[PDB]
Amino acid sequence: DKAPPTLWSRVTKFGSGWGFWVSPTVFITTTHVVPTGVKEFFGEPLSSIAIHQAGEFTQFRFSKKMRPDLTGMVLEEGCPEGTVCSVLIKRDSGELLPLAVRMGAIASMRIQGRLVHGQSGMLLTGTIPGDCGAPYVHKRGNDWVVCGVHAAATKSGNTVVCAVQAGEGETAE
Amino acid sequence: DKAPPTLWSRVTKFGSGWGFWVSPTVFITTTHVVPTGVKEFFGEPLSSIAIHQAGEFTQFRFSKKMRPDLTGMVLEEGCPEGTVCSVLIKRDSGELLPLAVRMGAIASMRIQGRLVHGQSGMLLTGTIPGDCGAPYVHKRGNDWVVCGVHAAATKSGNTVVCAVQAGEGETAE
Ligand code: NA
Ligand code: NA
């Protein structure tokens, strides 16, 4: 089914890319797009935010409700092999570009000199440099689950990588 | 039916409010939110734009395709008495707030000292100052039609006014 407007409304311009409101207080994004040298995010001073970063995954937990209009939704560490996700890409022009991607292995992979814990995927039937931070989502029953943020792609764009939360598990090491 | 994501994607932050891409080259907004003193809009120099303004209605026609992802859609001068429209409000936070409004008479009305050609409406079951420029749309058959841009509201917000294109006609003088 198609991503509803409210889901798109979670995708938010941030730094040199985008991020995603998981709930009224939780924002996720790709580490390398986070602005450098600032003293606040969304008008909130850094000391009022719990900032967790693991490789290319960044999560902010704000101490006040930033998007009280939203329900919380489920964030998971990647998804099973073969899961078809949608990358909810917003462009600066306002265009929405949902990209279908069949996900592969969760691994720590070397990307441009750095080790990155993420999940690779194959673009179906692409992304650009400004798209980093866009969420990878998939529908489970009647709800949407977010499981990664856009972090990298092969020059062609045919293979993509989403950063995912830290955590070891027997399906991924 | 609910406004689809693509329709929302036409609503665009602009000046002190918003505007709406009617087509890849046509952008409409409320005159008073248009930035003052600038030499370009969306990176295009003023001399490359056909700028039409009538009271509180402003239309830009750009000489290049600014949103080539979009189809053209129908813009009309207001709508019939009693038509239920939706005001597609975006908030700075990213929240989407579609507001239902039953439209009334098209008239030139005095608003804060100025004569404004527009259509008033009643909010059903509200707006804020930063919402000006948001489109008033309604569904006709399988398509959406845009017919005004948010221009004013009573302090409570219960009555709203959308600016509409210039034009006289026997249903409106
Ligand atoms: Na849809
Ligand atoms: Na909907």
Side-chain angles (χ1 to χ4, degrees), chain A residues 117-124 126-134:
Chain A
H117 179 62
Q119 193 169 5
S120 59
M122 180 187 101
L123 186 74
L124 304 173
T127 61
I128 66 172
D131 298 340
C132 292

Side-chain angles (χ1 to χ4, degrees), chain B residues 86-122:
Chain B
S86 184
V87 188
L88 305 183
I89 297 163
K90 282 186 171 174
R91 290 286 156 79
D92 278 337
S93 70
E95 174 179 13
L96 310 180
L97 192 68
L99 295 183
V101 182
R102 187 182 57 234
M103 300 305 294
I106 298 174
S108 286
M109 305 158 264
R110 187 175 61 190
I111 300 179
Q112 299 252 268
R114 293 179 157 104
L115 203 65
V116 173
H117 179 62
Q119 193 169 5
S120 59
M122 180 187 101

Side-chain angles (χ1 to χ4, degrees), chain A residues 3-6, chain B residues 1-5 8:
Chain A
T6 303
Chain B
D1 206 356
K2 297 210 188 201
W8 282 105

Side-chain angles (χ1 to χ4, degrees), chain B residues 76-85 101-109 111 116-122 136 138 146-152 159-165 171-172:
Chain B
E76 286 183 343
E77 184 193 349
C79 56
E81 280 270 12
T83 300
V84 177
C85 289
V101 182
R102 187 182 57 234
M103 300 305 294
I106 298 174
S108 286
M109 305 158 264
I111 300 179
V116 173
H117 179 62
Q119 193 169 5
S120 59
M122 180 187 101
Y136 284 47
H138 62 104
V146 57
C147 59
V149 287
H150 189 61
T159 292
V160 298
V161 177
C162 65
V164 304
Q165 297 166 295
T171 68

Side-chain angles (χ1 to χ4, degrees), chain A residues 25-112:
Chain A
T25 55
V26 173
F27 189 77
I28 61 176
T29 187
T30 295
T31 302
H32 78 255
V33 314
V34 180
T36 151
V38 298
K39 278 83 193 79
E40 56 108 302
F41 294 129
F42 299 114
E44 297 294 294
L46 298 186
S47 61
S48 70
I49 311 170
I51 302 167
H52 298 166
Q53 303 183 285
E56 285 295 317
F57 199 90
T58 289
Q59 178 183 279
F60 302 147
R61 180 177 298 269
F62 291 88
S63 57
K64 70 172 249 195
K65 274 66 189 141
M66 310 288 288
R67 287 288 304 267
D69 61 292
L70 298 172
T71 58
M73 62 182 284
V74 175
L75 162 66
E76 286 183 343
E77 184 193 349
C79 56
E81 280 270 12
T83 300
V84 177
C85 289
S86 184
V87 188
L88 305 184
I89 297 163
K90 282 186 171 174
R91 290 286 156 79
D92 278 337
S93 70
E95 174 179 13
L96 310 180
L97 192 68
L99 295 183
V101 182
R102 187 182 57 234
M103 300 305 294
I106 298 174
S108 286
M109 305 158 264
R110 187 175 61 190
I111 300 179
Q112 299 252 268

